[PDB]
Amino acid sequence: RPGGDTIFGKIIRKEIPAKIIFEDDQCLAFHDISPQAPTHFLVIPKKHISQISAAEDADESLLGHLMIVGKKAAADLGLKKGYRMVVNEGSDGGQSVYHVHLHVLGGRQMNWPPG
Amino acid sequence: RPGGDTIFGKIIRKEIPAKIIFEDDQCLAFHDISPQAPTHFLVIPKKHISQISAAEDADESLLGHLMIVGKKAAADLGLKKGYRMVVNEGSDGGQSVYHVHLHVLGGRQMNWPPG
Numbered sequence A, B: 001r002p003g004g005d006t007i008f009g010k011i012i013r014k015e016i017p018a019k020i021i022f023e024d025d026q027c028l029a030f031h032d033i034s035p036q037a038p039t040h041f042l043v044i045p046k047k048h049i050s051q052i053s054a055a056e057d058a059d060e061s062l063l064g065h066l067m068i069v070g071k072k073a074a075a076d077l078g079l080k081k082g083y084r085m086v087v088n089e090g091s092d093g094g095q096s097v098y099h100v101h102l103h104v105l106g107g108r109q110m111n112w113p114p115g
């Protein structure tokens, strides 16, 4: 129910653990299981929004909260030289789990194009 | 003054044109001059925030507004198969212009890692 039906719903309900680095009442941040950089974590809302194309206007503050949490977590993890934030939408975006998630990657030079 | 001192301040003040695809009172979206995908645009706040690490808690709604605008613009441009949103912070993130900007890329499969 709360948290939705995906892998990430299970993480939000704590049925399966994750390496949690931030939790407040709106969201959770945890290390990614398949890291693509020395630091690679996800920030997810506790509210189930399936994808960024399904977010509503009233979700603006929550979406922005995910980036503010990502900034805080990045600083707690020592990302003094910067980082990249990524949200994937749909097939072309590379989205594999239909629960919004913000990637935060750093600890190395990020290249261009971003995939 | 309003819009700040960077390339993007000049775009916001309209001193130099850009190919604008959305403007409301909070932000502007325009095509990127160096596109990395068939569709590649930027969404920027009109308020000068230098980088995502400098955004404040009260900027949450504005940051989320950038992603909602990006979703709308992507749909207006036909990105039915999805897209990737990217914010770069600092040197490791690949940030070159110190005014927050959200990249939206689509019209091709986006790869992984995201740089």
Ligand SMILES: Nc1ncnc2c1ncn2[C@@H]1O[C@H](CO)[C@@H](O)[C@H]1O
Binding pocket: A007, A018, A030, A031, A032, A033, A034, A035, A095, A096, A097, A101
């Ligand atoms: N159980 C899990 N814990 C942490 N990250 C996960 C888990 N399952 C999938 N992921 C990550 O979720 C992301 C979905 O975009 C991927 O980068 C993937 O590695």
Ligand SMILES: Nc1ncnc2c1ncn2[C@@H]1O[C@H](CO)[C@@H](O)[C@H]1O
Binding pocket: B007, B018, B030, B031, B032, B033, B034, B035, B095, B096, B097, B101
């Ligand atoms: N005058 C401009 N109009 C549109 N995009 C620009 C301009 N100058 C730089 N850019 C884009 O700004 C981005 C900064 O991250 C780059 O992808 C770059 O190509």
Ligand code: NA
Binding pocket: A071, A072, A073, A075, A076
């Ligand atoms: Na912090």
Ligand code: NA
Binding pocket: B071, B072, B073, B075, B076
């Ligand atoms: Na639209």
